[PDB]
Amino acid sequence: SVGLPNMTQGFWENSMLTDPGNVQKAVCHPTAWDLGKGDFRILMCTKVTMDDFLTAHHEMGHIQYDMAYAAQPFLLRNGANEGFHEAVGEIMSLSAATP
Amino acid sequence: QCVNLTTRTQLPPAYTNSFTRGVYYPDKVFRSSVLHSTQDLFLPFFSNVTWFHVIKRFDNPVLPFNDGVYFASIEKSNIIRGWIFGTTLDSKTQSLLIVNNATNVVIKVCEFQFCNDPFLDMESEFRVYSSANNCTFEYVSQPFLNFKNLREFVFKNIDGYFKIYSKHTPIDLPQGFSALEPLVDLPIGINITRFQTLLALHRSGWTAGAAAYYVGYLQPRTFLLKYNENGTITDAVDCAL
Amino acid sequence: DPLSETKCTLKSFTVEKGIYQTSNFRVQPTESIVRFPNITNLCPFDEVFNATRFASVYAWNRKRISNCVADYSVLYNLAPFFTFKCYGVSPTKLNDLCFTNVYADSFVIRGDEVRQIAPGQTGNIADYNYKLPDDFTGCVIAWNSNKLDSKVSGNYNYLYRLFRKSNLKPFERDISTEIYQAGNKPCNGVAGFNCYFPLRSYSFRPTYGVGHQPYRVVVLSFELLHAPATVCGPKKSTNLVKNKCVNFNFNGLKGTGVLTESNKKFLPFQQFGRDIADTTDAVRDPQTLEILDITPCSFGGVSVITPGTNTSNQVAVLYQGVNCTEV
Amino acid sequence: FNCYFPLRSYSFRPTYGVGHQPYRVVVLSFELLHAPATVCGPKKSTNLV
Amino acid sequence: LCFTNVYADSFVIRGDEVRQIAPGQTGNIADYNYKLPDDFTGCVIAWN
Amino acid sequence: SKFGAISSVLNDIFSRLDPPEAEVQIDRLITGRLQSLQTYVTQQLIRAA
Numbered sequence: 001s002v003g004l005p006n007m008t009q010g011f012w013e014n015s016m017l018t019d020p021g022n023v024q025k026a027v028c029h030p031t032a033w034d035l036g037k038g039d040f041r042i043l044m045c046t047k048v049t050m051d052d053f054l055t056a057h058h059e060m061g062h063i064q065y066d067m068a069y070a071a072q073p074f075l076l077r078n079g080a081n082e083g084f085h086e087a088v089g090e091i092m093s094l095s096a097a098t099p
Numbered sequence: 100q101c102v103n104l105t106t107r108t109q110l111p112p113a114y115t116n117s118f119t120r121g122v123y124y125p126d127k128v129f130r131s132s133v134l135h136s137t138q139d140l141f142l143p144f145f146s147n148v149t150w151f152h153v154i155k156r157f158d159n160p161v162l163p164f165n166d167g168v169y170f171a172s173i174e175k176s177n178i179i180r181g182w183i184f185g186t187t188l189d190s191k192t193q194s195l196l197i198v199n200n201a202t203n204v205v206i207k208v209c210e211f212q213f214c215n216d217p218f219l220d221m222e223s224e225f226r227v228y229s230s231a232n233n234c235t236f237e238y239v240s241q242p243f244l245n246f247k248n249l250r251e252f253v254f255k256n257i258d259g260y261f262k263i264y265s266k267h268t269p270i271d272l273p274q275g276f277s278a279l280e281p282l283v284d285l286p287i288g289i290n291i292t293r294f295q296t297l298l299a300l301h302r303s304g305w306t307a308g309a310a311a312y313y314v315g316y317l318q319p320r321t322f323l324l325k326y327n328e329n330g331t332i333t334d335a336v337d338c339a340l
Numbered sequence: 341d342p343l344s345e346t347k348c349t350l351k352s353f354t355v356e357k358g359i360y361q362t363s364n365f366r367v368q369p370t371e372s373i374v375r376f377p378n379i380t381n382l383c384p385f386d387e388v389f390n391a392t393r394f395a396s397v398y399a400w401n402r403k404r405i406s407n408c409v410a411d412y413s414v415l416y417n418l419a420p421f422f423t424f425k426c427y428g429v430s431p432t433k434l435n436d437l438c439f440t441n442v443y444a445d446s447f448v449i450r451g452d453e454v455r456q457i458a459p460g461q462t463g464n465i466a467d468y469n470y471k472l473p474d475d476f477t478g479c480v481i482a483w484n485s486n487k488l489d490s491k492v493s494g495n496y497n498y499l500y501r502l503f504r505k506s507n508l509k510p511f512e513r514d515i516s517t518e519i520y521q522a523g524n525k526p527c528n529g530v531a532g533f534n535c536y537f538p539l540r541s542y543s544f545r546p547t548y549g550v551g552h553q554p555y556r557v558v559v560l561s562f563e564l565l566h567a568p569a570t571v572c573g574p575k576k577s578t579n580l581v582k583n584k585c586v587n588f589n590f591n592g593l594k595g596t597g598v599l600t601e602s603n604k605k606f607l608p609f610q611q612f613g614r615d616i617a618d619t620t621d622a623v624r625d626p627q628t629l630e631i632l633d634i635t636p637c638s639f640g641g642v643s644v645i646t647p648g649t650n651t652s653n654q655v656a657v658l659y660q661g662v663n664c665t666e667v
Numbered sequence: 668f669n670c671y672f673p674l675r676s677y678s679f680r681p682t683y684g685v686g687h688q689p690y691r692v693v694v695l696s697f698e699l700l701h702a703p704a705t706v707c708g709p710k711k712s713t714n715l716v
Numbered sequence: 717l718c719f720t721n722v723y724a725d726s727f728v729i730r731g732d733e734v735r736q737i738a739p740g741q742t743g744n745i746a747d748y749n750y751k752l753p754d755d756f757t758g759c760v761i762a763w764n
Numbered sequence: 765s766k767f768g769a770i771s772s773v774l775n776d777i778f779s780r781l782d783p784p785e786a787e788v789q790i791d792r793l794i795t796g797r798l799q800s801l802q803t804y805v806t807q808q809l810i811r812a813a
């Protein structure tokens with residue numbers, strides 16, 4: 001709706017958004033994964049909560065930032081400074097939290 | 100595998116009259132009891148056709164192709180087997196190959212490096228070339244085959260087509276009329292300026308059997324052709340004789 | 341009616357007593373028919389498109405196509421070949437147009453580099469692996485090959501030339517493995533500082549994006565020379581129609597007439613028949629070796645006998661040269 | 668299979684060559700007939716002699 | 717000249733398909749998209 | 765007779781060429797055949813006299 005392109009189909013078959021269970025141990029920390037070579041994943045132990053919805057919007061903002069600089073070289077495939085990467089994902093949560 | 104033969108008995112080129120040989124169907128159209136005039140490459144009547152003798156006579160020279168060739172052979176026991184075709188007659192340019200073994204015929208257009216003295220040797224020893232680099236077309240069909248066999252061939256190269264006309268007649272050149280029917284069409288699209296016959300040598304060294312062949316060149320001229328009721332050519336007249 | 345047909349020819353509304361010839365009787369035509377010999381000796385498209393293994397982009401292969409009929413409709417009919425961008429010739433007319441030789445070029449590249457396979461384009465594949473001329477008469481076919489060219493551990497069998505001293509010429513293959521000279525110091529055969537191997541292996545895996553999944557690319561190059569065009573498209577055969585006034589196409593000849601059974605004895609090599617008028621009166625069907633007398637649709641002159649319209653209105657019709665058991 | 672969408676879309680890109688650049692084509696048809704002409708070229712009338 | 721009625725047809729085609737806009741000319745757009753009559757008086761304008 | 769055209773077969777001319785040039789070729793064929801027919805008619809008239 002805001003103008004960012006929809007994510008690729010590879011995200012669906014490569015990202016696990018639910019806790020695997022007791023048999024498999026997975027990190028529940030909210031982390032966005034830019035593996036490179038056009039591969040983007042988010043490690044999510046998402047629950048049905050408002051925060052996880054805002055956390056998801058905050059973490060897609062990280063990954064959505066990643067496809068933006070995909071054309072730039074790998075060493076330059078980063079934010080201009082350390083503050084930009086988290087800031088661009090925070091406005092996503094701020095806008096999604098509006099009534 | 101090349102072996103140079105020095106047992107040749109040198110002889111100056113011979114000649115004989117062509118009489119009324121070399122008439123072939125110029126197209127594939129049926130005509131009945133009509134006199135039709137056509138202009139195409141033809142062997143002029145009563146021309147001076149070269150005579151080559153095989154007997155110790157070993158006539159395997161290289162002749163120019165010009166606009167066309169009329170190949171005739173007074174043959175028995177099938178000493179003649181095939182021909183070579185090309186311009187530089189080596190691996191530099193594309194060359195054409197015609198061979199007829201005891202089973203069938205083999206047609207290949209490759210960058211052959213022919214032997215200086217190509218020939219064939221029961222017959223189970225084929226020694227006619229040394230290499231084959233780029234093969235662009237190959238064709239296989241049925242074999243073409245007292246002096247009892249007369250074989251007459253016509254070779255043409257127009258618009259990249261290699262036409263072959265043949266006629267087998269059971270019998271110097273005899274007096275009569277016999278039209279030559281088309282046999283095979285080859286869409287090769289190369290240029291040919293020289294050729295060389297391939298002969299089969301009998302090993303029991305080697306001895307050459309009783310055979311002879313003639314080479315005549317075609318010219319563009321007008322013939323008036325007479326068709327019978329059944330559609331075959333029975334007589335013709337050379338309009339410039 | 342014939343009386344009005346007479347008025348129409350005379351360009352008048354009153355007709356004097358006499359006999360007038362107006363028009364002719366040829367049973368009108370009706371259908372359109374085309375016949376060609378049996379479609380055999382199909383070009384080996386399966387051996388290239390359905391090949392078990394495709395070569396690397398730098399070792400891009402040559403497969404010349406000749407002396408066969410090429411059915412471009414079948415290859416286009418395959419659903420997986422979603423990408424089909426064709427250059428210099430309409431895909432529809434490829435089924436009919438003929439060329440001397442067809443060059444089939446096959447290799448494997450990434451999805452993002454598919455756009456580099458085009459005339460006037462640049463890139464690592466364009467400059468170092470495969471350069472395509474601007475005046476390119478032909479076109480390419482590309483499709484996803486993730487299911488075949490990708491392994492979970494990585495399919496490293498496919499390599500691309502990362503570095504070269506100069507851009508490749510059109511239709512030029514460079515398979516040299518000489519160490520690239522990136523600096524002024526000589527390489528001396530050692531891939532050290534400012535010296536690296538020009539070829540890099542693609543690490544294709546099924547867990548990549550759409551732009552990085554392997555894409556098998558088959559490139560078709562078409563050329564026309566003085567040599568005869570021996571690569572033709574398939575020809576459609578229409579069921580035979582006889583004893584009717586039809587338009588026929590037999591091996592490229594056009595005409596109109598009724599096709600009837602013929603008792604003529606053609607020679608085995610002969611195909612066409614001509615009368616003393618030098619007109620095609622007989623023809624041999626390509627599907628079945630039978631001779632069809634191309635009788636002109638029953639044609640005949642007509643003539644109307646009439647008294648003056650000042651006297652009466654009845655007319656009589658004469659068909660000269662026709663036995664009227666046939667009308 | 669054997670059932671395809673007949674409508675294909677031009678994906679025009681500025682990176683494409685002149686062979687694939689978009690071109691705007693305007694087709695003009697004239698009805699030069701015996702009907703009373705309505706489309707007039709630039710001309711000046713004159714008194715009837 | 718003076719015309720009775722004038723019609724303007726406008727569309728967008730590829731670069732190499734401009735030659736297919738001609739009377740009696742065959743092609744994909746000619747056969748399937750836009751065909752001009754043979755006895756056609758009038759003419760076309762194309763620009764980049 | 766070709767009468768200066770590329771082919772002596774009218775339908776072959778229609779089929780193998782575009783109609784814009786096939787029409788010119790057919791015009792050449794038609795005028796040649798009309799010339800032949802009128803020559804025949806004129807000679808017939810003289811012989812009839």
Ligand SMILES: *[C@@H]1O[C@H](CO)[C@@H](O)[C@H](O)[C@H]1NC(C)=O
Pocket residue numbers: 006007008009
């Ligand atoms: C993304 O959007 C484009 C354009 O609407 C569409 O073609 C594509 O299928 C979409 N992809 C996904 C995964 O929704």
Ligand SMILES: *[C@@H]1O[C@H](CO)[C@@H](O)[C@H](O)[C@H]1NC(C)=O
Pocket residue numbers: 327328329
């Ligand atoms: C033509 O063929 C018939 C057989 O149908 C034969 O009797 C006749 O002799 C042939 N004509 C010639 C001139 O050989």
